[PDB]
C-alpha cells in the first residue's frame with residue numbers, strides 16, 4: 001500500500017532525446033525512427049518571437065542549419081518541413097532506441113509524465129495533468145522547450161505533449177506531436193491569458209477512492225447525493241460538472257470498495273462545503289485532481 | 305519556472321532490473337556488473353517470515369534454486385552469498401546496461417527516486433525522502449520488494465535503498481545496497497513500530513526559498529528570529545532542530561533570493577504558529593519537507 005504521484009519509467013523516452021540547434025537557439029528534439037520532432041520556434045531568436053512569420057523565417061533555413069546531436073553524435077539532416085507548430089527534421093539514421101510509439105492528442109483531465117530536458121539531456125520526470133483550460137503546471141526553465149509528455153501501455157509510448165511556452169502567469173502551454181497547440185495558445189511572445197482553471201472532479205473522486213483503499217477514511221459520511229445536486233456544489237467550487245460517463249469510469253473503484261459513486265460524491269460535497277478542518281488525505285491538505293481513475297487502478301493493482 | 309516533486313530519469317536503473325525467484329517467492333533484483341542484489345527474504349515463504357533463521361534456510365538453497373530472469377532472458381547463477389539482509393547472486397554474464405554506479409548509505413532528511421517494480425518490470429518512478437525515523441512513505445504492493453532508490457550525478461547512479469518491508473502502519477522500511485536496514489527494522493513478520501516522524505526543517509526552508517523564486521511570496525514577513533528561538537518553535541511542532549550546518553547549506557538560496565536564513569526561519573515560525581489560513585505554497589496546503597536544499601538549486605538551475 002501507500003499512494004504517490006508516480007510518473008512512468010522514462011527510459012524509453014530518454015533514448016529519444018536529442019539536442020537541436022538552429023542559429024543561436026538550442027532546444028530539445030524527439031528522435032523516433034528517422035525523424036526528429038522539435039518546436040518550430042527553434043528557428044527564432046527572442047527578437048523574432050514578438051511576431052514571427054514562421055513560413056518566411058523557415059525559407060532562410062537549409063537542412064545544414066539544423067544541428068542535431070544525439071548525446072555526443074551528430075545526426076545528418078536530409079530533410080525538413082513544418083507541420084503546424086513543430087518541425088520535422090528527416091535524418092539519415094533511424095534511432096536504434098526507438099520504442100513502439102504512438103502520437104495521441106489527450107483530453108483535458110487526462111494525466112501524463114513529462115521528461116524535462118535541457119540541451120537534449122534528461123533532468124527529471126514528473127506526473128502532470130492537462131488542465132481543463134489546456135495548460136499544464138510544470139517545471140520548465142529556458143532550454144526546456146521540446147521536452148515531451150507521454151503515457152506508456154506495456155511496451156508502447158503514447159507521446160501526447162511537446163513543451164513550447166510559458167505564460168506570464170507561470171503556467172505551461174504546448175502542442176501534441178502533430179504540432180497543434182492544446183487550448184487557444186499561439187507560439188508568440190504575447191500575453192495570452194489562460195481561462196478559468198477548474199478542478200477535475202472525476203480525478204478527485206478517483207483519488208478519494210485511492211484514499212479509502214489505502215486507509216484514509218475519515219471523510220466518509222452517512223450521506224448520499226444526486227448528479228444534479230452534486231453539480232450545483234461543483235459549479236460553486238469551480239469543479240467540472242460530473243456526468244454519467246465519469247460515474248461509469250469510476251465503476252471499478254466503486255465495486256472494489258463497495259462505496260457507491262454518489263455516496264463518494266456526498267463525501268466530496270461535504271469536503272467542499274466544510275474544508276478539511278486541519279486534516280490530511282494521502283498526505284495532502286487539499287483535494288488532489290491529478291490522478292485519473294485509470295491511474296488509481298493501475299497504481300493499486302501493480303501494472304508494469 | 306514552476307516547481308514539481310521531480311524524480312531522476314530512471315532509464316539507467318530500468319536496465320538493471322531483473323526478476324528473482326526462489327521456490328514460490330518472486331521479487332526484484334538489481335543486476336550490476338556480474339552480480340544480482342535482492343532481499344534475502346526471497347528464500348522465505350510467508351510461513352517462514354514469522355521468525356526466519358536466514359542462515360539455516362539458505363543452507364537448503366543451491367545456485368540452481370535462484371532463478372534470475374532479465375526481461376525474458378535467463379541468467380546463469382554461478383555463486384550466492386548473504387551480506388546482511390541482501391543476497392548477492394553471482395551470474396556468468398556482466399549486465400551490458402550497467403551504468404557507472406556507487407552504493408551509498410544516505411542520511412535521514414536526504415531525498416531519492418524509487419523505481420517501483422513488479423516481477424523485474426518497472427511500473428513507475430517517484431521522489432522520496434528518508435524520514436528522520438528511517439522509514440519512507442512509498443507506494444509498494446506485494447512483489448515490489450527489491451525495488452531500489454537512487455540518486456544520479458550526471459552519469460553516476462548512487463543506489464541508496466532497496467525495499468524490503470511494509471510496517472503495519474503502511475510506511476516502508478528497507479536497506480542500503482550492503483543489506484543494512486535503515487533504522488531499527490528487522491526483516492521479519494513482526495510488529496515493529498517506527499518512531500516519531502519529525503519534519504525535515506532544512507527541507508521545508510529550502511522549499512520556502514523555491515516558493516519565493518517561483519513567485520509564491522505571501523508568507524514573507526517583517527520578522528526575524530534566532531536559531532535558539534526558532535528551535536523552541538521547531539520542538540513544539542515536531543520539526544527537526546535547525547543547526548548552523550543547515551543554515552550553511554541554505555547559503556546559496558539565501559544569496560540568490562537576498563532573504564537571510566533567519567528571516568526565512570521567522571516566516572516558517574509564523575506559518576507554524578498561524579497555519580496557512582486557507583492559502584497554498586507551490587500548489588501545496590501543507591509545508592513540504594521532501595525537497596533538500598540541493599534539489600531546490602538543481603531544479604531551479606536546470607541540472608541534467
Ligand SMILES: *CC(=O)N1Cc2ccccc2[C@@H](c2cccc(C#N)c2)C1
Nearest residue numbers: 025049142143144145164165187188189
Ligand atoms: C521553452 C524554451 O526553451 N524557450 C526558449 C526559447 C528559445 C528560442 C525562442 C523562444 C524561446 C521561448 C519562447 C518565447 C516565447 C514564446 C514561445 C513559444 N511558443 C517560446 C521559450
Ligand SMILES: *CC(=O)N1Cc2ccccc2[C@@H](c2cccc(C#N)c2)C1
Nearest residue numbers: 329353446447448449468469491492493
Ligand atoms: C515487499 C514484498 O514483495 N513482499 C512479499 C514477500 C515475499 C516473500 C517473503 C516476504 C514478503 C513480504 C515481507 C513480509 C514480512 C517482512 C518482510 C521483510 N523484510 C517482507 C513483502
